[PDB]
């Protein structure tokens, strides 16, 4: 009996460690004897440790995660794809946590519950990746969402943070209701919620004239929920406001991990299921809309956070082009894009968090940065050029695939849109470089140097961004492996 | 069978009529306190706990040890939450 | 179904009479403890006092203050009174003596109890009076707080019985009354019943002398009477529930032919009378808690103990395989 | 007919939820909607869910809403607006949803037209399933804690998040 | 609202639901014609596909 | 598809489901399992049964 | 409760025990398992101590970190030992001990 | 006709929630209430389908969805409370400062 639970050792450990940290934090934060010490950094270090131990347990036990698969079948499904997705999710969570300590001590954000909520949301996203039934998928999505709602409003006396939370909760709850409605329609039409059963029922028919309008609209509503989650246009406008109004570590965490989890869900639901061309057309139109709107709105922005939010919207458009084309290379390119975008976003938010120690808000606040911190201005410039997709930086992969699929699926309007939006993006990315290097403002802002954690993370992500294309084989092989494991 | 609910409806109708008769015969001759929200939240949580207890209580003879320990784990999570509330002063009305 | 209204009236009317005389019995017992005589002028031994008080109330002009919640103000007492009445549809007085033999009767009683709070809340809010509103909020919070412990004790009984059917709960006590092994649970249940019915030592609405205005202070004539009647009917119901769950309902004390001679309804009535006497006795014996103290007792004492009893009973019954 | 009555009550009560000027009144109508829903559940034979909808939706959730809305003391000027200018946008959105979504089951689940013949005699009774009938409660409890226990525990995690968030966002200890 | 207003709205809603019942009966009665139209269009499409495949 | 019935016995449409699943588990073309699939879906919704009975009712209303 | 240990991906090494008992797995702990266990626990205690200095709770922080490390290290050692007995990990020692007793 | 009548009941509840979103641009509390209405309609959809299909999966998920609805309302009302506390008002013009 005990050995059956080897399939959930990683999750058991992280949940138990989260409980231990909750108890530790609440017991000593309330201690008069110790004079109510702030425990955000102490619990943060212990939680980073817990995340790393979870990663060790998961990575080193790859076969064991598939033990007792028949017993666990109606609860979840673990395979190679989920293996790599969960490893990447844990790595992203560890990096995001490591970027938070200067924020904890200098702002004096003393709430250790922040770390606990991050860990519980990580548990939720882990269960999201392995979900193999509509019920499990919904429950894990809701756990993740509720944790985000709470942490988005963590600055509870701030107008901005409270506004972010309110908008997030209302729009999140609305989208979740729409998705749940879709799930109910699919169950009513097919008598099934398990992904295997849905695959068997729906395969071979798609729209064979006598199409289940119940099945067709259930798929549509579920897709609407998914598109809200990935911040695809027209279900996107929550994202810029929430990203800007939330505390910056929250914004960094939301920018990466939920995308990984929800894209795992989307792959395993749609790609593994079957209504077909309708849904790929959904993602096609949403990709085009996201690219165009992201480019234009980002061009309008004068503030750093909003610029990065709109940039992420545009990039999810680029990524969803891969899902749309419906090929093994499409899935592989989507995964490569997710990985590279995540690393670049981690780099960008490490810089943003470093600059938040002097309250960076506007793009113009970067003036004369090439004088006051030359190596920081260069590092940030490499990130921008990578965001623009200039070769040989890592960001060039997403552009290359966008056009590869445009000429592979046979889509020339898509190629035209890609060209135009890429040029617009390059303009608003090099505007930052111009501000740091070319401008001569009358008043300068002198920034405090970053802590060791962010400097090390920045140093590694900056080598990856510059040098990835010299040795890109491991990512290519692992992503091809994952794309194949979805069906075999 | 749902047959036994019909007398309840007729009982409700009669009780309502008695209420109207009794009440109608004499016509012939800005300070928000968060602790209420908090007690509402606690009641909601333990209301759901009782809700989940009901099927478990009637099903103990069939679920045996596995069901017992799964409910115990459920209770462990909820009781950790309760300990958190207790330490934070949510249960103190002074 | 044509005879169903006759059965319903045969429940409701004697219940209203019983409430009218419960008020008199409370006055009499309180007086006798206090070395005085209660009402003994209006009728022989004061037995006509309830009819006179009810007649006075119906002959009293209603006030209906100039509020903006004219409908809600009068409907709140109707709601609480109807809820007090409808719980008796599932109460069995003897084997086969019950209006609705609900399989889900225990949860139905819990639902009715949970619904009881709305009359008090709406009366407080609709009365256009800050004192009534504050008192109603405090009373509502107290009732919801003690409802948790009531529900957990219900779960303990359910674990022992394996069915939500009240008659089955009674007949599961043929071997032994549940109040013997679960005596601390019965004490907890009685105290929680006191708190849930806003009764002494938990009667905040009665604490006008303590600068705590009750939720029904703006009510006159028959709305106030409806609130009062619902409260006393709920006291009778809580006594009946204590009898059903822990004292074996209609069962005799000993399974002997001498005890089986007297009908089960009489056994049930006698146990209910004992519990009503304890209600009155407790009101006569002790002072009252403050609101904060009783809230602390609800969340810090009775909830943990109720949960612990759930765990202990279930674990013991699972271990030795004594489950129903 | 009975479903017509309950659906009419639900329709009117829901319109009152979304259109009452006073938010306290909206909460009270919401409570009427849950009562009607419970009636439907009793018609379906799901007495456990019928009772739980009263216990949780009305007994706990609506009470929370009522406590919060009552202490807010909202003035109508802060939330008033004329809705006559929304009739067209609601007309198109409602109609499209109406035409698509009230009739989605019609092609898959074609109704049996009631004929002028007693079909009740064609009801076949299998007594084998009637020897030991299961309540809704015990059928649900046979599954929640053993075969689908992981989802049960994840729901517990969701409730824990609710408790933590409620404390962290609103607590001001005296 | 007035109590009588709520009652009248309930009556109007009852009429609406009975009308919806009539609509459902109409939709059910036209299943056969819709099937016939679907079959004729399927035959036309199949004939066109077979004829164009001849070239 | 789950097999858990609402009254504590095997679900009404579970044997049809299992026949369809067992067919699809070895037939490389889903068109070979079309008949079993439409039997499963007929058990869920009774569409063809009710359509045929409505045809009978229609003819009765036409000949009266 | 019906159980089935059968994994999706078969073991690539000889199966000494398909579903080893808890105490058998613990008794199967090797020197390398104990090294992993002790290293994880020691690192966790060190992190607890160092992160606890600024709040002033280095002792209790050491205890908390040590509890996390003890649980994680035991889970990791159990994972390795059970995987060896089940044939999922290289298990030369287990096979040698099995072919003799 | 039973199943079409049970489904249109839940459907009117869902459409009412949608309309409540559409008609309440100055009243975000009612917007939250409309979202609960939609969640109730979905829950009813699962229960009706469970009976119609003779399958228990609809019932398990209905209970879990009730848990989600409870947690959602708790957290949402907390966020409402803190927004009101910061601004002293619930009017929508005081929650429009993030834009562009
Ligand atoms: C033969 C027997 C004779 C003896 C028995 C006779 C019994 C008496 C008759 C029954 C009662 C009828 C009279 C009602 C009271 C009138 C007296 C009065 O003083 O009213 C004052 C009233 C003032 O309002 P108030 O109550 O004081 O509240 C003030 C504030 O609003 C309060 O603030 P608030 O916050 O509480 O509320 C906010 C907001 C509340 O906002 C709202 O309520 C929205 C108002 C618009 C309602 C829209 C329709 C809602 C009904 C649902 C219908 C189906 C909808 C389907 C939509 C989904 C489909 C996609 O307030 C309002 O907007 C008030 C507007 C009220 C207008 C109601 C109009 C209803 C629509 C009628 C349509 C008729 C069409 C007929 C066919 C229908 C199709 C089948 O003014 C009126 O006179 C209007 C009421 C009169 C019309 C309503 C009753 C209609 C009944 C028709 C008869 C039934 C026909 C079908 C029979 C079927 C048989 C098979
Ligand atoms: C076989 C069956 C036989 C049945 C026989 C009985 C048939 C009765 C037919 C009556 C229709 C003809 C009426 C002719 C005119 C009568 C003369 C007259 O109106 O003077 C009366 C006069 C007020 O009349 P008005 O001039 O129109 O003034 C109206 C407003 O002031 C105007 O001010 P406003 O504009 O500012 O409005 C504010 C709002 C006030 O704000 C509100 O929110 C109103 C309250 C609504 C929600 C309140 C309940 C939720 C709160 C929680 C309560 C506890 C929950 C748990 C306990 C209950 C659950 C079982 O006022 C209203 O909206 C009132 C609308 C009433 C809708 C609610 C009542 C319908 C409930 C469904 C009944 C189902 C059966 C009937 C339908 C059958 C099929 C057709 O005074 C009274 O009504 C006396 C107060 C006592 C009322 C007690 C009613 C029961 C209360 C306790 C139960 C609560 C739950 C309700 C039942 C739930 C069932 C599960
Ligand atoms: C604690 C607090 C307090 C508040 C509260 O809780 C909280 O308090 C709680 C208290 C609750 C009430 C409790 C109780 C009820 C009664 C229920 O109402 C029963 C209705 C059902 C039962 O009705 C019949 O059931 C049997 C017949 O079915 C009868 O058996 C005969 O027939 C047997 C067979 O020959 C013989 O063998 C027997 O010997 C022979 O006797 C039986 O006598 C009779 O009862 C369903 O019936 C219908 O359903 C049919 C199907 O749809 C419809 O068929 C139609 O459609 C068909 C096509 O579809 C066409 O083919 C048809 O031609 C065409 O007619 C039709 O409309 C109608 O029949 C309606 C809900 C309500 C009000 C609750 C509301 C909510 C509360 C107030 C709660 C509230 C919230
Ligand atoms: C001091 O504390 C006390 C109260 O609270 C202040 C009381 O309300 C009351 C009295 C309250 C009552 C007697 C209510 C009794 C009501 C009933 C028994 C039901 C109705 C009885 C009647 C005589 C009304 C008759 C009504 C009709 C329409 C006549 C047709 C029948 C007492 C005795 C009391 O001691
Ligand atoms: C060809 C690529 C495609 C095009 C993209 C080009 C992107 C760059 C744009 C080119 C235009 C000119 C760029 C000018 C940058 C050169 C100046 C520079 O970066 O110097 C840095 C140097 O920045 C670095 O530190 C770069 C380190 C990267 C290490 C990469 C080498 C890896 C192996 C080397 C091993 C170690 C050294 C071996 C020999 C000792 C000095 O930084 P400061 O901020 O001035 O002071 C630093 C503080 N302090 C001197 C006190 C330490
Ligand atoms: C307020 C009280 C708090 C209590 C906290 C302590 C207990 C918490 C629960 C800890 C898990 C179980 C610990 C008890 C050890 C004894 C377990 C045991 O006796 O083994 C039994 C088996 O016990 C179990 O396997 C149940 C384990 C409960 C599940 C606990 C969750 C652990 C991790 C789950 C991972 C899923 C992801 C979590 C999602 C949040 C043997 O039963 P059987 O195989 O002979 O037959 C089965 C049964 O009799 C018939 O149905
Ligand atoms: C791939 C391209 C090429 C990359 C090349 C990689 C080469 C390997 C890297 C070599 C590293 C060289 C430096 C090694 C010596 C530094 C040792 C750190 C000492 C240390 O204890 O640092 C502590 C802080 O932790 C820290 O600062 C460490 C944590 C910093 C984050 C590191 C990552 C952790 C999370 C993982 C994220 C993964 C993201 C992937 C998506 C305390 O420091 P202090 O004493 O100065 O006091 C700080 C005030 N509080
Ligand atoms: C998902 C995983 C994503 C990882 C992305 C790839 C790692 C990050 C790349 C950016 C930093 C490394 C730049 C590449 C180094 C430039 C020289 C490349 C090279 O040919 O050296 C070989 C690779 O060394 C290396 O291994 C490169 C240094 C380690 C990085 C050693 O040559 P070799 O013979 O040992 O390997 C078999 C090759 N023929
Ligand atoms: C895992 C399953 C259940 C999960 C949930 C429950 C987990 C258990 C609760 C954990 C909460 C944290 C407990 C912290 C206890 C600290 C005790 C304390 O005050 O220590 C101070 C107390 C006295 O030192 P002082 O603070 O200098 O006065 O103890 C120590 O500091 C001892 C330090 C030496 C320990 C090193 C070895 C640790 C190995 C792991 C054990
Ligand atoms: C400058 O002049 C003006 C306009 O003109 C730009 C206006 O509009 C308006 C006011 C009216 C508006 C804004 C209605 C437009 C709203 C829409 C379309 C709702 C959808 C929301 C967004 C953000 C659009 C995103 C959707 C896209 C790009 C396409 C949908 C998705 C796919 C194809 C997959 C005003 C006053 C105006 O003065």
mmCIF file with all atom_site columns, C-alpha atoms in Angstrom, chain C residues 27-127:
data_model
loop_
_atom_site.group_PDB
_atom_site.id
_atom_site.type_symbol
_atom_site.label_atom_id
_atom_site.label_alt_id
_atom_site.label_comp_id
_atom_site.label_asym_id
_atom_site.label_entity_id
_atom_site.label_seq_id
_atom_site.pdbx_PDB_ins_code
_atom_site.Cartn_x
_atom_site.Cartn_y
_atom_site.Cartn_z
_atom_site.occupancy
_atom_site.B_iso_or_equiv
_atom_site.pdbx_formal_charge
_atom_site.auth_seq_id
_atom_site.auth_comp_id
_atom_site.auth_asym_id
_atom_site.auth_atom_id
_atom_site.pdbx_PDB_model_num
ATOM 1   C CA . UNK C 1 27  ? -42.685 31.530 35.537 1.00 0.00 ? 27  UNK C CA 1
ATOM 2   C CA . UNK C 1 28  ? -43.899 29.016 38.142 1.00 0.00 ? 28  UNK C CA 1
ATOM 3   C CA . UNK C 1 29  ? -40.563 27.219 38.587 1.00 0.00 ? 29  UNK C CA 1
ATOM 4   C CA . UNK C 1 30  ? -38.626 30.503 38.668 1.00 0.00 ? 30  UNK C CA 1
ATOM 5   C CA . UNK C 1 31  ? -41.026 31.790 41.328 1.00 0.00 ? 31  UNK C CA 1
ATOM 6   C CA . UNK C 1 32  ? -40.814 28.638 43.447 1.00 0.00 ? 32  UNK C CA 1
ATOM 7   C CA . UNK C 1 33  ? -37.014 28.798 43.452 1.00 0.00 ? 33  UNK C CA 1
ATOM 8   C CA . UNK C 1 34  ? -37.387 32.454 44.492 1.00 0.00 ? 34  UNK C CA 1
ATOM 9   C CA . UNK C 1 35  ? -39.718 31.523 47.398 1.00 0.00 ? 35  UNK C CA 1
ATOM 10  C CA . UNK C 1 36  ? -42.670 33.312 45.781 1.00 0.00 ? 36  UNK C CA 1
ATOM 11  C CA . UNK C 1 37  ? -45.793 32.336 43.873 1.00 0.00 ? 37  UNK C CA 1
ATOM 12  C CA . UNK C 1 38  ? -45.893 32.778 40.133 1.00 0.00 ? 38  UNK C CA 1
ATOM 13  C CA . UNK C 1 39  ? -49.150 33.640 38.381 1.00 0.00 ? 39  UNK C CA 1
ATOM 14  C CA . UNK C 1 40  ? -51.919 32.114 40.496 1.00 0.00 ? 40  UNK C CA 1
ATOM 15  C CA . UNK C 1 41  ? -54.741 34.683 40.148 1.00 0.00 ? 41  UNK C CA 1
ATOM 16  C CA . UNK C 1 42  ? -55.749 34.509 36.464 1.00 0.00 ? 42  UNK C CA 1
ATOM 17  C CA . UNK C 1 43  ? -57.525 31.168 36.550 1.00 0.00 ? 43  UNK C CA 1
ATOM 18  C CA . UNK C 1 44  ? -57.103 28.486 39.175 1.00 0.00 ? 44  UNK C CA 1
ATOM 19  C CA . UNK C 1 45  ? -53.383 28.107 39.986 1.00 0.00 ? 45  UNK C CA 1
ATOM 20  C CA . UNK C 1 46  ? -52.804 30.696 37.260 1.00 0.00 ? 46  UNK C CA 1
ATOM 21  C CA . UNK C 1 47  ? -53.765 28.236 34.523 1.00 0.00 ? 47  UNK C CA 1
ATOM 22  C CA . UNK C 1 48  ? -55.637 30.885 32.495 1.00 0.00 ? 48  UNK C CA 1
ATOM 23  C CA . UNK C 1 49  ? -52.681 33.313 32.430 1.00 0.00 ? 49  UNK C CA 1
ATOM 24  C CA . UNK C 1 50  ? -51.403 32.314 28.936 1.00 0.00 ? 50  UNK C CA 1
ATOM 25  C CA . UNK C 1 51  ? -54.810 32.803 27.317 1.00 0.00 ? 51  UNK C CA 1
ATOM 26  C CA . UNK C 1 52  ? -55.144 36.245 28.916 1.00 0.00 ? 52  UNK C CA 1
ATOM 27  C CA . UNK C 1 53  ? -51.671 37.287 27.756 1.00 0.00 ? 53  UNK C CA 1
ATOM 28  C CA . UNK C 1 54  ? -52.340 36.091 24.205 1.00 0.00 ? 54  UNK C CA 1
ATOM 29  C CA . UNK C 1 55  ? -55.697 37.884 24.139 1.00 0.00 ? 55  UNK C CA 1
ATOM 30  C CA . UNK C 1 56  ? -54.031 41.076 25.391 1.00 0.00 ? 56  UNK C CA 1
ATOM 31  C CA . UNK C 1 57  ? -51.440 40.775 22.626 1.00 0.00 ? 57  UNK C CA 1
ATOM 32  C CA . UNK C 1 58  ? -53.968 40.322 19.815 1.00 0.00 ? 58  UNK C CA 1
ATOM 33  C CA . UNK C 1 59  ? -56.008 43.256 21.189 1.00 0.00 ? 59  UNK C CA 1
ATOM 34  C CA . UNK C 1 60  ? -52.886 45.483 21.228 1.00 0.00 ? 60  UNK C CA 1
ATOM 35  C CA . UNK C 1 61  ? -52.578 48.032 18.414 1.00 0.00 ? 61  UNK C CA 1
ATOM 36  C CA . UNK C 1 62  ? -49.620 47.358 16.091 1.00 0.00 ? 62  UNK C CA 1
ATOM 37  C CA . UNK C 1 63  ? -47.056 50.120 15.664 1.00 0.00 ? 63  UNK C CA 1
ATOM 38  C CA . UNK C 1 64  ? -45.087 49.410 12.461 1.00 0.00 ? 64  UNK C CA 1
ATOM 39  C CA . UNK C 1 65  ? -42.568 52.276 12.680 1.00 0.00 ? 65  UNK C CA 1
ATOM 40  C CA . UNK C 1 66  ? -42.062 54.558 9.700  1.00 0.00 ? 66  UNK C CA 1
ATOM 41  C CA . UNK C 1 67  ? -39.162 52.575 8.226  1.00 0.00 ? 67  UNK C CA 1
ATOM 42  C CA . UNK C 1 68  ? -38.224 51.972 4.596  1.00 0.00 ? 68  UNK C CA 1
ATOM 43  C CA . UNK C 1 69  ? -38.363 48.178 5.125  1.00 0.00 ? 69  UNK C CA 1
ATOM 44  C CA . UNK C 1 70  ? -42.073 47.896 5.821  1.00 0.00 ? 70  UNK C CA 1
ATOM 45  C CA . UNK C 1 71  ? -42.447 44.398 4.317  1.00 0.00 ? 71  UNK C CA 1
ATOM 46  C CA . UNK C 1 72  ? -39.263 42.918 5.808  1.00 0.00 ? 72  UNK C CA 1
ATOM 47  C CA . UNK C 1 73  ? -40.042 44.252 9.284  1.00 0.00 ? 73  UNK C CA 1
ATOM 48  C CA . UNK C 1 74  ? -43.260 42.263 9.516  1.00 0.00 ? 74  UNK C CA 1
ATOM 49  C CA . UNK C 1 75  ? -41.989 39.214 7.636  1.00 0.00 ? 75  UNK C CA 1
ATOM 50  C CA . UNK C 1 76  ? -39.014 38.507 9.932  1.00 0.00 ? 76  UNK C CA 1
ATOM 51  C CA . UNK C 1 77  ? -41.129 37.181 12.868 1.00 0.00 ? 77  UNK C CA 1
ATOM 52  C CA . UNK C 1 78  ? -43.176 35.152 10.378 1.00 0.00 ? 78  UNK C CA 1
ATOM 53  C CA . UNK C 1 79  ? -39.981 33.540 9.088  1.00 0.00 ? 79  UNK C CA 1
ATOM 54  C CA . UNK C 1 80  ? -38.644 32.622 12.525 1.00 0.00 ? 80  UNK C CA 1
ATOM 55  C CA . UNK C 1 81  ? -42.054 31.334 13.673 1.00 0.00 ? 81  UNK C CA 1
ATOM 56  C CA . UNK C 1 82  ? -42.573 29.178 10.573 1.00 0.00 ? 82  UNK C CA 1
ATOM 57  C CA . UNK C 1 83  ? -39.065 27.748 10.914 1.00 0.00 ? 83  UNK C CA 1
ATOM 58  C CA . UNK C 1 84  ? -39.727 26.891 14.560 1.00 0.00 ? 84  UNK C CA 1
ATOM 59  C CA . UNK C 1 85  ? -42.940 25.145 13.508 1.00 0.00 ? 85  UNK C CA 1
ATOM 60  C CA . UNK C 1 86  ? -41.699 23.135 10.536 1.00 0.00 ? 86  UNK C CA 1
ATOM 61  C CA . UNK C 1 87  ? -38.953 21.206 12.364 1.00 0.00 ? 87  UNK C CA 1
ATOM 62  C CA . UNK C 1 88  ? -41.662 19.121 14.072 1.00 0.00 ? 88  UNK C CA 1
ATOM 63  C CA . UNK C 1 89  ? -42.697 17.433 10.809 1.00 0.00 ? 89  UNK C CA 1
ATOM 64  C CA . UNK C 1 90  ? -39.849 14.909 11.203 1.00 0.00 ? 90  UNK C CA 1
ATOM 65  C CA . UNK C 1 91  ? -39.877 14.478 14.994 1.00 0.00 ? 91  UNK C CA 1
ATOM 66  C CA . UNK C 1 92  ? -41.052 10.982 16.007 1.00 0.00 ? 92  UNK C CA 1
ATOM 67  C CA . UNK C 1 93  ? -42.962 10.720 19.298 1.00 0.00 ? 93  UNK C CA 1
ATOM 68  C CA . UNK C 1 94  ? -43.249 6.899  19.260 1.00 0.00 ? 94  UNK C CA 1
ATOM 69  C CA . UNK C 1 95  ? -42.740 4.065  16.809 1.00 0.00 ? 95  UNK C CA 1
ATOM 70  C CA . UNK C 1 96  ? -44.591 5.141  13.678 1.00 0.00 ? 96  UNK C CA 1
ATOM 71  C CA . UNK C 1 97  ? -45.786 8.427  15.235 1.00 0.00 ? 97  UNK C CA 1
ATOM 72  C CA . UNK C 1 98  ? -44.213 10.956 12.872 1.00 0.00 ? 98  UNK C CA 1
ATOM 73  C CA . UNK C 1 99  ? -45.522 13.125 10.042 1.00 0.00 ? 99  UNK C CA 1
ATOM 74  C CA . UNK C 1 100 ? -42.576 12.766 7.631  1.00 0.00 ? 100 UNK C CA 1
ATOM 75  C CA . UNK C 1 101 ? -40.316 9.700  7.900  1.00 0.00 ? 101 UNK C CA 1
ATOM 76  C CA . UNK C 1 102 ? -37.397 11.435 6.213  1.00 0.00 ? 102 UNK C CA 1
ATOM 77  C CA . UNK C 1 103 ? -34.334 9.335  5.441  1.00 0.00 ? 103 UNK C CA 1
ATOM 78  C CA . UNK C 1 104 ? -32.309 12.574 5.481  1.00 0.00 ? 104 UNK C CA 1
ATOM 79  C CA . UNK C 1 105 ? -34.022 13.906 8.604  1.00 0.00 ? 105 UNK C CA 1
ATOM 80  C CA . UNK C 1 106 ? -30.855 14.720 10.565 1.00 0.00 ? 106 UNK C CA 1
ATOM 81  C CA . UNK C 1 107 ? -29.490 16.938 7.790  1.00 0.00 ? 107 UNK C CA 1
ATOM 82  C CA . UNK C 1 108 ? -32.960 18.484 7.408  1.00 0.00 ? 108 UNK C CA 1
ATOM 83  C CA . UNK C 1 109 ? -32.896 19.491 11.082 1.00 0.00 ? 109 UNK C CA 1
ATOM 84  C CA . UNK C 1 110 ? -29.416 20.945 10.593 1.00 0.00 ? 110 UNK C CA 1
ATOM 85  C CA . UNK C 1 111 ? -30.702 22.945 7.610  1.00 0.00 ? 111 UNK C CA 1
ATOM 86  C CA . UNK C 1 112 ? -33.646 24.337 9.603  1.00 0.00 ? 112 UNK C CA 1
ATOM 87  C CA . UNK C 1 113 ? -31.296 25.316 12.415 1.00 0.00 ? 113 UNK C CA 1
ATOM 88  C CA . UNK C 1 114 ? -29.045 27.078 9.899  1.00 0.00 ? 114 UNK C CA 1
ATOM 89  C CA . UNK C 1 115 ? -32.064 28.932 8.483  1.00 0.00 ? 115 UNK C CA 1
ATOM 90  C CA . UNK C 1 116 ? -33.124 30.218 11.910 1.00 0.00 ? 116 UNK C CA 1
ATOM 91  C CA . UNK C 1 117 ? -30.602 33.095 11.841 1.00 0.00 ? 117 UNK C CA 1
ATOM 92  C CA . UNK C 1 118 ? -32.334 35.101 9.101  1.00 0.00 ? 118 UNK C CA 1
ATOM 93  C CA . UNK C 1 119 ? -35.346 36.201 11.135 1.00 0.00 ? 119 UNK C CA 1
ATOM 94  C CA . UNK C 1 120 ? -33.091 37.768 13.763 1.00 0.00 ? 120 UNK C CA 1
ATOM 95  C CA . UNK C 1 121 ? -30.789 39.388 11.188 1.00 0.00 ? 121 UNK C CA 1
ATOM 96  C CA . UNK C 1 122 ? -33.670 40.838 9.168  1.00 0.00 ? 122 UNK C CA 1
ATOM 97  C CA . UNK C 1 123 ? -35.489 42.071 12.280 1.00 0.00 ? 123 UNK C CA 1
ATOM 98  C CA . UNK C 1 124 ? -32.356 43.907 13.374 1.00 0.00 ? 124 UNK C CA 1
ATOM 99  C CA . UNK C 1 125 ? -31.635 45.478 9.998  1.00 0.00 ? 125 UNK C CA 1
ATOM 100 C CA . UNK C 1 126 ? -35.206 46.392 9.024  1.00 0.00 ? 126 UNK C CA 1
ATOM 101 C CA . UNK C 1 127 ? -36.085 48.067 12.337 1.00 0.00 ? 127 UNK C CA 1
#
